[PDB]
Nucleic acid binder design. Structure first.
Ligand SMILES: [Mg+2]
Lengths: 223, 57, 98, 123, 114, 93, 97, 223
RNA sequence: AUGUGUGCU
């Protein structure tokens, strides 16, 4: 027959999509490829590497700044930016602040067509005489790439940062059983998606389906 | 038995429950009440966790 | 091989010879002594328990058989071997909860 | 008459007919109400042989009071269904739980799938 | 816990953080190795979000049994992605995230008793 | 699990009290028309084919979901034996 | 294996992953070539298997092989009961028939 | 960086397909979902019911016939009967012969737009005076259809046969690598398909692709 | 309707 697609969205991050009824087996058949696509294909961005002034190693501690360097570096990974035009491929955010102020992700001086979809993300609390002058790289990767795989040495002694590109935080799916009067062994696809807010779940799903279709068009010109 | 009858049959239970009885009934937890799910096949399907209760393999 | 024969499951040959007529109801045997003794091949005889006993031929017309060699299979034999089931490619592993 | 569509012989059902739980196997009456022999709630199947021991019986016993007996061999072929009992020679009993289709079954790098999956926790 | 590989200390060596780490990248000591106090899997891989650690697992970089560093409710935790996944399971099972991390135990594997 | 049973068990002195309450509630809810319910406008039990649980699929489900709100009160003796039976059949079809 | 290595196919990425995990497991010997690792595994009755409903190889080699399994005399159709209300008896009102 | 598609169709029973390159693990993301549809769906052709000359029930025998009725019919399942046009929905093949000869499947009376790809198939050995006069009805369906379901009564004593519709017999995929000297981690998909002949592996592959595509379209309108 | 026997749990 024809399966209906029902959405239960909760804002901009979480959505639960249910497509039913499905022919036997097609539940995982459809649900599983998308899950792979979602966690590794959707184009987002991330912090690839960061340079700080009085910081040499990744495992250092800067007095005046309470939070250890690694802790800050985590929070750098926790932010999500968005590029207005496709032209922007690699952009560098600049940051500078001193004293008993704290730095949030909105303090990064806005560079051209760069939007910060998450401003109040705590970057670092600073004490008296706490000087902090850092800079951050932003590339347009696709998925997750450990720091010790790229480590973009933008400056001379910058620090590699694990690049968490994939907009989806996580994607989980299940195939329950549904009936159609005659038969009860009909697959029921329930697919839940968790994002960082860069893109709503439905948009991401749209992305997945498109990506799969374009791939299905590759089996057309034999040689 | 057409679709109508089956759909009706789902409308006749909903919250209703049935009692499932073990071969040798020993202790209190030897008979439980479960909500019936219209499953194909011909054997009674029983939940994993309630086995060791009335000792069923 | 011993079980099927000793249990009188299948039918064997009594004396050397060639094959006359392989039907699904009979197997006629060419004894050298100018004799062909009639063999029934019984298809659907209800067991005392409920199962079905079938004797099916295992030699083709125009073949020389020997004394004590099989001509048909029993309800649970395959070419003379006790056939009590199936040989299935099994993977031993836990699978969901099934 | 629709229930008699299989009744071929004058009293005996045809051989090779399909009988189902409630189908009429034998036709006979007593003191006139129907007291015939129908197929039990279980299952019939396909008739293979119909034995009938009459009164003019060339040397039989036959139960006292009874004039004639009508026995029907209803055969049927049963496939392996969820719930059947399977075991080996080493001694692992086990009822069939699910019959997964070929596609969602653990398979080798070769195109060849597995037939049966046996829990290691039973060992 | 695998072969010690090369050198087993970091109970205090100030250099051992930036140094021994590179060792694993060389060939010296494997990932979840009892390299004392920590292990390269804890230094190399620090995951910001508790969720993100599990996202990394789906990219075959760290197994659900490799000891790494995560951050549940805002603090550094020495544990494996699988364990934090167990924590998350119990959490979202009963909707109460607070007691979920309190009721379980994240220092030993899960058995009948646990 | 069931509609918030922990609230229900705590709601009464003995666990059996709840059972009798629910049962009798279902009974009168079925015998005197399913209209004498105490939560029929928007906050009400529904089903899956149509939303037609609004009428009469299950009796107990209703009783349990009703008791969940302070709309009903149980107890030993509250109303005379016959009078209750009479007026409960009068006020409704 | 000779069939594959000969036909024009080699060590699948999935096989390689499973081997990598098998090293940590303790079955295969650290050092050999993926082919020899697979040999060591095959010797132990174990072989790389794919989930089938995903494609993801089951992380950890499992012993596979054909065994002899027999369908016992019990069935389910031989034992199936489901009556709500039917015949009773003239001598005893307890339901059976 | 555009995926190349190579075909290696050896005959009509076997078929091999190559796709290279794919970005990251996208081989498995395509390999499995197709294998599922290739084994599950796809229109096939099998024998539905058969009527023998004097045979009434499935549990019989025939004078001059080594194989009992069940065994004979059991062979008809291993038969492949390739049609030509979609119009052919119910082709009732006929077969009758006598004399000492192995009745191969190449003896069926030929029909207008129908071909038997499986000629050598053993039906029954005929004995001195053995003679069989049978009508083998062939239908077109999909997937596994147990005979105890349809029960197609062609004649009157016709005995229904398990319909096993699935031209695709076996499928397996392999994921290699190489190509593009820049990024190392890449995928190379190689999908091997074995079909019974009624449908060439290429045709099956294309059909499966169409199926998957149609299923992808379903995620359109939410509710 | 009771006994004998076997099968499984
Ligand atoms: Mg038991």
């Amino acid at each position: 027959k024809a399966p209906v697609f029902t959405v239960r969205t909760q804002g901009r991050e979480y959505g639960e999509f249910v497509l039913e009824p499905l022919e036997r087996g097609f539940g995982v058949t459809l649900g599983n490829p998308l899950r792979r696509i979602l966690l590794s294909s959707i184009p987002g961005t991330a912090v690839t590497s960061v340079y700080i002034e009085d910081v040499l190693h990744e495992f250092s501690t800067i007095p005046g700044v309470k939070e250890d360097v690694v802790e800050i570096i985590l929070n750098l990974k926790e932010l999500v930016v968005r590029f207005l035009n496709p032209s922007l491929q690699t952009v560098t955010l600049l940051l500078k602040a001193e004293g008993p102020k704290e730095v949030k992700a909105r303090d990064f001086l806005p560079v051209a067509d760069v939007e910060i979809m998450n401003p109040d993300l705590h970057i670092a609390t600073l004490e008296e005489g706490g000087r902090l002058n850092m800079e951050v790289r932003v590339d347009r990767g696709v998925g997750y790439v450990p720091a010790e795989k790229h480590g973009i040495k933008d400056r001379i002694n910058a620090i590699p940062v694990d690049a968490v590109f994939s907009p989806v935080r996580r994607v989980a799916f299940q195939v329950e059983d549904t009936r159609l009067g005659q038969r009860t062994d009909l697959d029921k696809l329930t697919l839940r998606i968790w994002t960082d807010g860069s893109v709503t779940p439905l948009e991401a799903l749209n992305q997945a389906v498109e990506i799969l279709r374009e791939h299905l068009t590759y089996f057309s010109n034999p040689q | 038995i057409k679709d109508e009858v089956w759909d009706a049959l789902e409308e006749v239970i909903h919250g209703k429950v049935v009692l499932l009885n073990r071969a040798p009934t020993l202790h209190r937890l030897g008979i439980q009440a479960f909500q019936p799910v219209l499953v194909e096949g011909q054997s009674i399907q029983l939940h994993p966790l309630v086995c060791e209760a009335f000792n069923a393999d | 091989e011993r079980v099927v024969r000793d249990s009188l499951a299948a039918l064997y040959a009594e004396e050397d010879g060639e094959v006359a007529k392989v039907d699904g109801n009979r197997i006629v045997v060419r004894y050298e002594d100018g004799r062909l003794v009639e063999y029934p091949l019984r298809r659907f005889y209800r067991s005392n328990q409920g199962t079905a006993l079938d004797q099916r031929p295992r030699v083709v017309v125009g073949q020389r058989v020997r004394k004590g060699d099989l001509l048909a299979d029993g309800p649970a034999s395959e070419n003379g071997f006790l056939a009590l089931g199936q040989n299935v490619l099994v993977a031993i592993m836990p699978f969901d909860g099934y | 008459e629709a229930a008699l569509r299989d009744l071929d012989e004058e009293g005996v059902v045809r051989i090779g007919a399909e009988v189902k739980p409630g189908d009429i196997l034998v036709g006979r009456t007593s003191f006139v109400k129907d007291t015939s022999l129908r197929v039990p709630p279980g299952e019939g199947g396909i008739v293979v042989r119909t034995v009938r021991l009459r009164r003019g019986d060339p040397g039989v016993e036959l139960k006292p009071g009874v004039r004639e007996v009508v026995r029907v061999y209803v055969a049927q072929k049963r496939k392996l269904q969820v719930g059947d009992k399977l075991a080996n020679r080493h001694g692992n009993k086990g009822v069939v739980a699910k019959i997964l289709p070929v596609e969602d079954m653990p398979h080798l790098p070769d195109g060849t799938p597995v037939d049966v999956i046996l829990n290691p926790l039973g060992v | 816990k695998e072969k010690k590989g090369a050198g087993l200390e970091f109970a205090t060596p100030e250099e051992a953080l930036a140094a021994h780490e590179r060792g694993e990248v060389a060939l010296n000591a494997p990932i979840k190795v009892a390299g004392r106090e920590t292990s390269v899997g804890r230094l190399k891989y620090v995951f910001a979000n508790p969720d993100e650690a599990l996202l990394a697992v789906a990219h075959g970089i760290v197994d659900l049994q490799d000891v790494v560093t995560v951050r549940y409710m805002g603090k550094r935790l020495e544990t494996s992605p699988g364990r934090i996944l167990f924590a998350r399971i119990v959490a979202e099972a009963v909707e109460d995230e607070k007691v979920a991390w309190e009721l379980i135990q994240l220092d030993v594997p899960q058995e009948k008793n646990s | 699990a069931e509609p918030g049973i922990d609230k229900l068990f705590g709601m009464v002195d003995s666990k059996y009290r709840l059972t009798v309450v629910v049962a009798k509630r279902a009974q009168q809810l079925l015998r005197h028309g399913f209209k004498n319910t105490v939560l029929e406008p928007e906050e009400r039990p529904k089903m899956q084919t149509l939303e037609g649980l609004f009428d009469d699929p299950n009796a107990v489900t209703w009783a349990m979901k009703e008791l969940l709100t302070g709309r009903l009160v149980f107890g030993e003796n509250l109303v005379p034996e016959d009078r209750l039976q009479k007026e409960m059949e009068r006020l409704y079809p | 294996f000779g069939k594959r290595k000969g036909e024009g196919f080699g060590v699948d990425k999935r096989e390689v992953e499973v081997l990598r995990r098998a090293e940590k497991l303790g079955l295969v010997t650290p050092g050999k070539t993926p082919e020899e690792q697979l040999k060591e595994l095959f010797l132990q009755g174990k072989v790389v298997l794919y989930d089938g409903r995903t494609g993801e190889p089951i992380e950890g080699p499992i012993v596979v092989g054909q065994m002899f399994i027999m369908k016992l005399y019990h069935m389910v159709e031989d034992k199936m009961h489901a009556r709500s209300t039917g015949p009773y008896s003239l001598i005893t009102q307890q339901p059976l028939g």
